[PDB]
């Protein structure tokens, strides 16, 4: 099954965390990485000013069940998601989201697939569009259509 996973990091210099996460994703059992999008930078989301986010999309071939995959991505968040900052470990700065899982629709206490808000997020849709321009959602919507309809700004590469 092809699973599409979003990676986000808001560390100030996130490349080493993101590469650690990618490696960890490639090491998930019963699975392998098919393709990785470019790394994209997106601003904040508040008045003051929070760090830029690095966003990317990964295509993962897997024979795990969806909730088994989530156990692994949450495990990677716990193992790689915090960076030591001087005398203490920082808060989680890595976010792994399952955006799509095959053509499956999932609604459990743990999993909402397709990702619950991805159609509102240029930072999720544009990296996916790079690696899957012809993608169709389980409800029949086409990825291209969502981007055409909302006209989300394109994001700069990191």
Mask: binding to ligand ADP, 115-134, rule CB under 6 A, as x and -? x-------------------
Counting Cα atoms < 13 Å in the Cβ hemisphere of 32 gives 1
Smaller CB separation from ligand ADP, 91 or 151: 91
Cβ atoms of 145 and 155 within 8 Å: the answer is: no
60 contacts ligand ADP (rule: CB under 6 A): no
In this structure, what is the dihedral angle of CA atoms 18, 20, 22, 27, given to the nearest 10 degrees?
-160
Q: Which of 41, 75, 92, 144 is catalytic?
A: 92
Please choose which of ligand ADP, Mg ion, none residue 113 contacts, taking the beta carbon within 5 to 8 angstroms, the exact cut-off set by kind: ligand ADP
In this structure, what is the dihedral angle of CA atoms 134, 157, 4, 131, given to the nearest 10 degrees?
30
70 contacts ligand ADP (rule: CB under 6 A): yes
CA 65 from chain center: how many Å? Answer: 18
Q: Supply the minimum distance, in Å, between the C-beta of residue 148 and Mg ion.
A: 28
97 contacts ligand ADP (rule: CB under 6 A): yes
Cis omega before residue 114 (within 30°)? Answer: yes
- Residues making contact with Mg ion (CB under 5 A): 95, 97
Q: What are the residue numbers of the active site?
A: 82, 92, 95, 97
**Residues interacting with ligand ADP, by CB under 6 A?**
70, 95, 97-98, 110-113, 115
């Amino acid at each position: 099954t092809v699973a599409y996973i979003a990676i986000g990091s808001n560390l100030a210099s996130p490349l080493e965390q993101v590469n650690a996460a990618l490696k960890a994703l490639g090491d998930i059992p019963e699975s392998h990485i098919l393709t990785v999008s470019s790394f994209y930078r997106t601003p904040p989301l508040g008045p003051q000013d929070q760090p830029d986010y690095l966003n990317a999309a990964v295509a993962l071939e897997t024979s795990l069940a969806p909730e088994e995959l989530l156990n692994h991505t949450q495990r990677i968040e716990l193992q790689q998601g915090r960076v030591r900052k001087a005398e203490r470990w920082g808060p989680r700065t890595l976010d792994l989201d399952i955006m799509l899982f095959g053509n499956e629709v999932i609604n459990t206490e743990r999993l909402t697939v397709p990702h619950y808000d991805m159609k509102n997020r240029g930072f999720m849709l544009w990296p996916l569009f790079e690696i899957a321009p012809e993608l169709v959602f389980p409800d029949g919507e086409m990825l291209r259509q969502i981007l055409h309809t909302r006209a989300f700004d394109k994001l700069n590469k990191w």
